[PDB]
Amino acid sequence: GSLDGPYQSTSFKPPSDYWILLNPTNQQVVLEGTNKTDIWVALLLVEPNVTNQSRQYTLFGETKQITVENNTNKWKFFEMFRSSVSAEFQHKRTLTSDTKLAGFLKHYNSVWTFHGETPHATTDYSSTSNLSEVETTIHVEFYIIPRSQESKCVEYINTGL
Ligand SMILES: CC(=O)N[C@H]1[C@H](O[C@H]2[C@@H](O)[C@@H](CO)O[C@@H](O[C@H]3[C@H](O)[C@@H](O)[C@H](O)O[C@@H]3CO)[C@@H]2O)O[C@H](CO)[C@@H](O)[C@@H]1O[C@@H]1O[C@H](CO)[C@H](O)[C@H](O)[C@H]1O[C@@H]1O[C@@H](C)[C@@H](O)[C@@H](O)[C@@H]1O
């Protein structure tokens, strides 16, 4: 079949009903997304077998010190989240993965991401009253997949390109 992409790293407002399939190599911050009203979401990537490692990540213009741990042989995407500009970032969800792929979707009233552990990763959401204004800074090569082909995106997440 066909897959729309790759697109190079960039900043833009993805249309609703299209998955962004993220394809990092060694980037530390993979994606930043915000509408500046009730959604701030960032995905951090941590390699296998890391214990208590203090690292630096810049999120939405704010350079942060975050200590990370990954005691598995798989990679981990950490989903960092907050609902207002002056709040602390909290670790909201995790995706444990041997494919190194993650996703981002705007649909209906929510932003969707993947969580869990491959090859059985699943989707979950954060709701918003201002979906249309969510802009994503994507730090990696990426692909676009229509929501009508979400099952293909799930396959990629779980077993790879
Ligand atoms: C059950 C389902 O369809 N889940 C999919 C989810 O659907 C959202 C939409 O239906 C949306 C309306 O367009 O409503 C969302 O629910 C709202 C509530 O109505 C609202 O009150 C509350 O405040 O906010 C929630 C969240 O917005 C539905 O959740 O869309 C997801 C994003 O595309 C999609 O991932 C999810 O798909 C299901 O995922 C689970 C595992 O997470 C399983 O794989 C299911 O098999 C899968 O559903 C299947 O694919 C979807 C795309 C659709 O074709 C289904 O018919 C199909 O069974």
Residue numbers in the entry: 63 to 223
What does the report in the manuscript say about this coordinate set?
RV is a non-enveloped double-stranded RNA (dsRNA) virus with three concentric capsid layers encapsidating eleven dsRNA segments. The outermost layer contains the glycoprotein VP7 and the protease-sensitive spike protein VP4, which define the classification of RVs into G and P genotypes, respectively. RVs use the VP8* domain of the spike protein VP4 to recognize specific host glycans in a genotype-dependent manner. Our studies show that VP8* of these genotypes engages the type I precursor glycan (Galβ1,3-GlcNAc) at a unique and conserved binding site that is present in all P, P and P HRVs, and the subtle sequence and structural changes lead to an altered glycan configuration at the reducing end in the neonate-specific P RV, that may play a key role in the age-restricted tropism of some P strains.
The P VP8* in our X-ray crystallography and NMR studies is from the neonate-specific HRV vaccine strain RV3. To understand how the VP8* of neonate-specific P HRV recognizes type I glycans, we determined the structure of P VP8* with H-type I pentasaccharide (also known as Lacto-N-fucopentaose I or LNFP1) at the resolution of 1.8 Å. Distinct from the HBGA binding sites in P and P HRVs or the Sia-binding site in ARVs, the H-type I glycan binding site consists of one of the β-sheets and the C-terminal α-helix of P VP8*. The residues L167, W174, T184, T185, R209, and E212 are involved either in hydrophobic interactions or in a network of direct or water-mediated hydrogen bond interactions with type I precursor Galβ1,3-GlcNAc at the non-reducing end. The Gal4 moiety interacts with R209 and H169 via hydrophobic and hydrogen bonding interactions, and also in hydrophobic interactions with Y170 and W174. The reducing end of the H-type I glycan is further stabilized through a set of interactions between the Glc5 moiety with the residues H169, N171, S172, W174, and Y187. In the complex structures, the sidechains of Y170 and N171 change orientation to engage in a hydrophobic interaction with Gal4 and a hydrogen bond interaction with Glc5 of the glycan, respectively. In addition, the side chain of R209, that forms a hydrogen bond with E212 in the apo structure, binds to GlcNAc via hydrogen bond and hydrophobic interactions in the structure of P VP8*/H-type I complex. As a result of the rotational changes in the glycosidic bond in the neonate-specific P VP8*, the reducing end of the glycan is brought closer to VP8* establishing a number of hydrophobic interactions involving Y170, N171, and Y187 and hydrogen bond interactions involving N171 and S172. Remarkably in the neonatal P VP8*, a single residue H169, which is well conserved in most neonate-specific [P6] genotypes, alters the conformation of the glycan to sterically restrict branching at the reducing end.
